[PDB]
A paper describes a structure:
We additionally determined structures of the free hISG15 and K48-Ub2 to 2.15 and 1.25 Å resolution, respectively. An analogous comparison of our unbound K48-Ub2 structure with the only known PLpro-bound conformation of K48-Ub2 (from SARS-CoV-1)28 revealed an rmsd of 10.2 Å. The Ub units are oriented very differently relative to each other, with the PLpro-bound Ub2 in an extended conformation (like hISG15) while the unbound Ub2 in an open conformation with the functional hydrophobic surface patches exposed for binding. In the open conformation, the functional binding surface on Ub is exposed, while in the closed conformation, the functional nonpolar surfaces are engaged in intramolecular Ub-Ub interactions (arrow). Moreover, different Ub linkage types may exploit different interdomain conformational spaces explaining the source of specificity.
The Papain-like protease (PLpro) is a domain of a multi-functional, non-structural protein 3 of coronaviruses. PLpro cleaves viral polyproteins and posttranslational conjugates with poly-ubiquitin and protective ISG15, composed of two ubiquitin-like (UBL) domains. PolyUb and ISG15 have common other structural features: ISG15 comprises two Ub-like (UBL) domains and mimics a head-to-tail linked di-ubiquitin (Ub2).
Numbering used by the authors:
A (entry chain A): 1 to 73
B (entry chain B): 1 to 75
Write the structure that this text describes.
Amino acid sequence: MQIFVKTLTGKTITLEVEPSDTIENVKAKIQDKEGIPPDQQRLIFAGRQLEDGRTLSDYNIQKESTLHLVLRL
Amino acid sequence: MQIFVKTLTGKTITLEVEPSDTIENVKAKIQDKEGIPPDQQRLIFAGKQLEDGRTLSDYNIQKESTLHLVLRLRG
């Protein structure tokens, strides 16, 4: 399925993911598109930070859900 | 130098490491003590997951720092 990620400039990118993808897998997909290493990425959904070991479906992330990318400072 | 690792039960072990040790090397040292293969280990420090190709030095991990071992499980 497709999900969206709001990037550091507020532009939206589109990823192909599965409900069983872990957040660590999703951060690797974001690294491919944005060039930010996973250990520098905070991923936010519904106003909370996601943990690396959970799946997208563990957070009830759906088709065409939007995640937010934040850079670790 | 000495660092600590909190294991899957919350017990702490000690590792002998150098600041130049990679995280992949540290996972191999954890395998020797805990019997968990490196590809099944998530190593956490300061609330974030460490990447294999970085050194302890790259995360400013110092003597007596405590890392957290988590088992790779979806969920």
